[PDB]
Amino acid sequence: MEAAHSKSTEECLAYFGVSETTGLTPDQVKRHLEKYGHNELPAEEGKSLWELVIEQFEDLLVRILLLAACISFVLAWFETITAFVEPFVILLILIANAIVGVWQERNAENAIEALKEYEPEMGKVYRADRKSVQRIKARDIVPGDIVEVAVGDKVPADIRILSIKSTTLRVDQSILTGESVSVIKHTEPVPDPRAVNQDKKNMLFSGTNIAAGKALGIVATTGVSTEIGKIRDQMAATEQDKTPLQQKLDEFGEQLSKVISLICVAVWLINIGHFNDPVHGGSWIRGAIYYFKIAVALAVAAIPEGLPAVITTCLALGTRRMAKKNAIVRSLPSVETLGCTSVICSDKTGTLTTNQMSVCKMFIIDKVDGDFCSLNEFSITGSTYAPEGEVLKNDKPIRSGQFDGLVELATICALCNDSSLDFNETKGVYEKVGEATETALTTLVEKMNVFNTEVRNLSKVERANACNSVIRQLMKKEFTLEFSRDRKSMSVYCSPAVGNKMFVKGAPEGVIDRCNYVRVGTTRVPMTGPVKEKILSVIKEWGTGRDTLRCLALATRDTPPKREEMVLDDSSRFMEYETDLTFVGVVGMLDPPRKEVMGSIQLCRDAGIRVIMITGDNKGTAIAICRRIGIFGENEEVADRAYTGREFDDLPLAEQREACRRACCFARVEPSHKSKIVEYLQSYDEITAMTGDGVNDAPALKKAEIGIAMGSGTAVAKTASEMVLADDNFSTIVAAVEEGRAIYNNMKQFIRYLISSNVGEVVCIFLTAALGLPEALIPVQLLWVNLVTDGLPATALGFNPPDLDIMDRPPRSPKEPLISGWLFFRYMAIGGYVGAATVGAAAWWFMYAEDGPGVTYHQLTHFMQCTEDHPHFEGLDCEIFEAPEPMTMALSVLVTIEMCNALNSLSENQSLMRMPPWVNIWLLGSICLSMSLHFLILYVDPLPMIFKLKALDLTQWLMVLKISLPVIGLDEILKFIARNY
Ligand SMILES: C/C=C(/C)C(=O)O[C@H]1C(C)=C2[C@H]([C@@H]1OC(=O)CCCCCCC)[C@@](C)(OC(C)=O)C[C@H](OC(=O)CCCCCc1ccc(/N=N/c3ccccc3)cc1)[C@@]1(O)[C@H]2OC(=O)[C@@]1(C)O
Numbered sequence: 001m002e003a004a005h006s007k008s009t010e011e012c013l014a015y016f017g018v019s020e021t022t023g024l025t026p027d028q029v030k031r032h033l034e035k036y037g038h039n040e041l042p043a044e045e046g047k048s049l050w051e052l053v054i055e056q057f058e059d060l061l062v063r064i065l066l067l068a069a070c071i072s073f074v075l076a077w078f079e080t081i082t083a084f085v086e087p088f089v090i091l092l093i094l095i096a097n098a099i100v101g102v103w104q105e106r107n108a109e110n111a112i113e114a115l116k117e118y119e120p121e122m123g124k125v126y127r128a129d130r131k132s133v134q135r136i137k138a139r140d141i142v143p144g145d146i147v148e149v150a151v152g153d154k155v156p157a158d159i160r161i162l163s164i165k166s167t168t169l170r171v172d173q174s175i176l177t178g179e180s181v182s183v184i185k186h187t188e189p190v191p192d193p194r195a196v197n198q199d200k201k202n203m204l205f206s207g208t209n210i211a212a213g214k215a216l217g218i219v220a221t222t223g224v225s226t227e228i229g230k231i232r233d234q235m236a237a238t239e240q241d242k243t244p245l246q247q248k249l250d251e252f253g254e255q256l257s258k259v260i261s262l263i264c265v266a267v268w269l270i271n272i273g274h275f276n277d278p279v280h281g282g283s284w285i286r287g288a289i290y291y292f293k294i295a296v297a298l299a300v301a302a303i304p305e306g307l308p309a310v311i312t313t314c315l316a317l318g319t320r321r322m323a324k325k326n327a328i329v330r331s332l333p334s335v336e337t338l339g340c341t342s343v344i345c346s347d348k349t350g351t352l353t354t355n356q357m358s359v360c361k362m363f364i365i366d367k368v369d370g371d372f373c374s375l376n377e378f379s380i381t382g383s384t385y386a387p388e389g390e391v392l393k394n395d396k397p398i399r400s401g402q403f404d405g406l407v408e409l410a411t412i413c414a415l416c417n418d419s420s421l422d423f424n425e426t427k428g429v430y431e432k433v434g435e436a437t438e439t440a441l442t443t444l445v446e447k448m449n450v451f452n453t454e455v456r457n458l459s460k461v462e463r464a465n466a467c468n469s470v471i472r473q474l475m476k477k478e479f480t481l482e483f484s485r486d487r488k489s490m491s492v493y494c495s496p497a498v499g500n501k502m503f504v505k506g507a508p509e510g511v512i513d514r515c516n517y518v519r520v521g522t523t524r525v526p527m528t529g530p531v532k533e534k535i536l537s538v539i540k541e542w543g544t545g546r547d548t549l550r551c552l553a554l555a556t557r558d559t560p561p562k563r564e565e566m567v568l569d570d571s572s573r574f575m576e577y578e579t580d581l582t583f584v585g586v587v588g589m590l591d592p593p594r595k596e597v598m599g600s601i602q603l604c605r606d607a608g609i610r611v612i613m614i615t616g617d618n619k620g621t622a623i624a625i626c627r628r629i630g631i632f633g634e635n636e637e638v639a640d641r642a643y644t645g646r647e648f649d650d651l652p653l654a655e656q657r658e659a660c661r662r663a664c665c666f667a668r669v670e671p672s673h674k675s676k677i678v679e680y681l682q683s684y685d686e687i688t689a690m691t692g693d694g695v696n697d698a699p700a701l702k703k704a705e706i707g708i709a710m711g712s713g714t715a716v717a718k719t720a721s722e723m724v725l726a727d728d729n730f731s732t733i734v735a736a737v738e739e740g741r742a743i744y745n746n747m748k749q750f751i752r753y754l755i756s757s758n759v760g761e762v763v764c765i766f767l768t769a770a771l772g773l774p775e776a777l778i779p780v781q782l783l784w785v786n787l788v789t790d791g792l793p794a795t796a797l798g799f800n801p802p803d804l805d806i807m808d809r810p811p812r813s814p815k816e817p818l819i820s821g822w823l824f825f826r827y828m829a830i831g832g833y834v835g836a837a838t839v840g841a842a843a844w845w846f847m848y849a850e851d852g853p854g855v856t857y858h859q860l861t862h863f864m865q866c867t868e869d870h871p872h873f874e875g876l877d878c879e880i881f882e883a884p885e886p887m888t889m890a891l892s893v894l895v896t897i898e899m900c901n902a903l904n905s906l907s908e909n910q911s912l913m914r915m916p917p918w919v920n921i922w923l924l925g926s927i928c929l930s931m932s933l934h935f936l937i938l939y940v941d942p943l944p945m946i947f948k949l950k951a952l953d954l955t956q957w958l959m960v961l962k963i964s965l966p967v968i969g970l971d972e973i974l975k976f977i978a979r980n981y
């Protein structure tokens with residue numbers, strides 16, 4: 001049954017054809033099981049380790065490296081023990097990344113799997129095969145089963161309550177909405193078919209816990225058809241878009257594949273003269289090997305092997321840094337999307353305010369005389385739940401007992417209240433026991449002390465519930481009509497130890513409309529026009545004005561109906577029992593905003609981040625609270641920038657999307673509205689942060705770019721969110737967004753640094769193949785630089801001091817490329833220099849170097865013909881063309897250039913003369929280690945044979961410096977162009 005809440009208990013039994021006493025027959029269970037399936041959510045389609053490994057090798061760049069490794073293995077097979085080092089190192093990189101990926105997925109947690117912790121293992125049913133109850137597996141429960149639940153039981157399916165075998169039935173529905181008080185259930189049907197779950201007073205939802213009582217019911221839906229099952233299907237459908245940087249890697253990969261292939265065509269076209277080369281000759285087996293080991297070098301030089309290690313280590317350190325600021329980020333790639341947040345949708349009571357109620361104002365009727373009227377407004381000091389306060393009128397201490405209207409006012413707050421106070425010695429602070437708005441009333445009557453009781457000598461524990469207990473002795477709480485959203489009030493039936501009385505509290509409009517009289521001290525006066533208008537006017541002054549208070553109308557029924565003429569089980573008749581009331585007074589309490597929220601809203605204004613408030617208050621107070629914390633101006637018109645649940649649904653889908661682009665406040669939203677607002681924001685390409693703390697909020701948290709859960713929220717809300725606020729404070733979001741922009745600012749820099757190095761390395765290898773020179777750089781050397789020599793200053797670039805105007809700029813566009821425009825031309829000139837500096841360095845030692853054999857450029861270009869001992873050759877040893885020394889010139893030039901290029905990466909356009917290189921201390925320290933590591937591989941005896949290197953003379957290093965140092969001069973010239981032109 002889709003709408004079993006709207007059907008009577010007889011209609012539900014008639015639908016399935018099951019008796020409440022006998023239960024489903026064995027043949028009915030057979031057919032109901034085949035029709036509706038088993039009472040369980042679908043299992044996770046877990047990927048195999050093989051599936052992950054394939055995923056690791058699905059990336060094009062990884063595939064290129066694997067191909068290069070294979071070519072290297074073959075070349076090593078047909079070539080010195082060092083030969084197979086190159087294949088192994090490449091493979092080790094790939095293997096490690098895969099292991100990292102596998103570990104990441106294993107650590108990852110799935111919210112849908114979390115939903116299964118709310119699936120009980122067992123369930124109690126009544127079936128026709130046995131007379132007594134049967135405790136079967138909850139998986140085997142089918143719709144139409146007669147199910148019994150009691151205290152401690154977890155509800156196994158969506159159950160329509162048939163009969164409550166106890167006095168009352170209280171259910172803990174906290175998994176749906178978060179930390180909440182138990183809800184009373186009944187058996188009468190709910191008229192509205194489109195009613196929300198909060199109003200389904202006759203339904204037991206799967207996963208909830210029975211707080212107290214015992215009832216018999218009939219199963220309405222099972223599996224994915226339950227309310228918790230519908231939420232799973234919404235989460236399954238939600239697709240997680242790749243972070244902008246992840247998409248850029250996909251872009252950089254496919255564009256790099258085109259350049260590598262076009263270079264292979266370019267080298268073939270440049271060396272097309274080999275078609276006119278004679279046929280007889282052994283240089284063809286050497287030629288194919290020459291271009292194959294250049295292809296391996298071309299792949300290593302193009303791919304930044306160390307970039308993922310530097311990226312994942314900067315995000316991991318930023319997560320530890322955010323954790324000290326109470327921001328628990330779960331996914332590392334989501335830190336980039338955190339700095340890109342454009343709209344923040346936040347709840348109020350948990351995040352924007354402290355959720356610590358306290359009565360601040362109250363008024364009782366002072367005098368009614370025809371058209372004249374006067375009230376007795378009061379002020380209450382003390383913002384905590386402690387009974388330490390003072391009642392004031394016109395800022396003057398008063399004794400509350402001297403006013404008779406306050407005596408009846410306090411008895412309502414003490415009796416029409418299900419909460420209490422309690423003192424904790426481990427913290428020395430009075431704590432809350434129950435609802436926050438009800439605990440404020442118990443604290444209020446303690447500050448009043450309307451009976452002038454002596455509490456000075458009472459202990460702190462006794463002081464907490466002392467004046468309340470006195471009032472509790474005077475009257476006897478017979479029964480309680482619980483709160484319901486249709487009448488928005490609750491009442492209690494009391495008798496003395498004079499006839500009986502009823503004390504009512506609730507929303508002002510509903511309670512005052514049911515008042516026919518007005519309490520004036522101890523007398524009674526009929527409710528008239530000018531009195532009701534004076535009362536309702538002060539209601540709007542406290543709820544809409546600067547006070548932003550939540551008002552509660554308090555009334556009594558001096559002549560309640562007879563006890564036998566009342567039915568305490570019909571929740572629909574509760575409003576009829578709460579009629580013909582006498583207005584006593586109104587109590588207004590404040591949910592104060594946090595201290596750091598007002599400044600955090602202004603930081604979002606300076607950073608171009610829009611804040612949207614989501615409350616449960618009426619539209620008048622929600623707009624008033626927005627004007628208080630800074631969402632709206634005090635005199636700013638907000639006719640089309642604030643909506644409610646009914647207002648938003650009464651709009652067509654066209655005007656709903658237009659409303660979400662200008663709205664900054666949503667009051668009393670339906671459960672589906674959070675996911676609808678996210679989609680409308682995403683339709684405008686907004687990066688939306690959404691808050692929530694229950695399974696109801698779980699689909700909206702996954703749909704939003706960044707779900708934000710509460711540290712005190714449910715486990716499902718945390719597993720569904722990208723960030724968890726440890727202190728539930730809204731300011732943690734702004735601090736996490738600020739840190740997200742700061743991380744990406746430094747992250748943008750070392751990416752450009754490592755990428756520009758790969759550009760210069762390719763130009764170096766393209767010049768080697770286009771001219772026919774010996775290999776100036778070997779893939780083993782390039783891997784050592786791209787992983788270690790350049791990876792250390794890249795990590796150091798992640799610690800660059802952040803800009804002082806980060807929160808003064810609009811959020812970054814996700815489609816903004818890292819390198820484009822004039823910067824794209826810079827790294828071409830820089831890369832064109834590195835490629836020419838390294839190739840020219842190795843060609844120097846071969847040609848103009850005194851320490852090295854002078855050789856003609858033709859000989860160097862035609863060095864593969866040395867074997868002939870041609871007359872064109874001078875009989876020079878052919879082994880010279882394989883000498884180690886020249887590869888050290890190209891390597892030391894490349895290393896020193898990247899050390900200089902790392903200094904130029906401290907700023908995009910600012911000069912080093914203006915922003916000095918010693919701004920980042922970690923960058924200078926990383927350069928020292930990287931250079932020392934260069935000497936380690938140059939001098940420590942095992943390493944240079946592995947890297948095919950030899951030490952350089954003090955004269956040779958000066959040649960490296962005069963070739964590498966002009967990089968700073970070249971890059972400063974390019975920076976000087978962007979600044980002044
Ligand atoms: C890398 C080396 C070379 C030689 C190359 O071809 O690079 C070109 C290239 C692909 C781009 C271009 C480059 O084009 C040129 O330089 C053309 C010069 C021609 C000169 C001819 C002289 C005769 C770029 C380089 O030109 C310059 C001059 O910088 C600029 C730009 O690139 C980026 O902005 C970086 C995004 C990073 C994204 C983040 C990222 C993180 C980790 C990554 N891998 N982790 C791995 C780990 C393990 C395994 C594998 C990977 C990869 C990326 C782009 O145009 C880019 O193709 C694009 O679509 C843009 C918008 O991305």
Ligand code: NA
Pocket residue numbers: 701702703704705706707720721722
């Ligand atoms: Na999400």
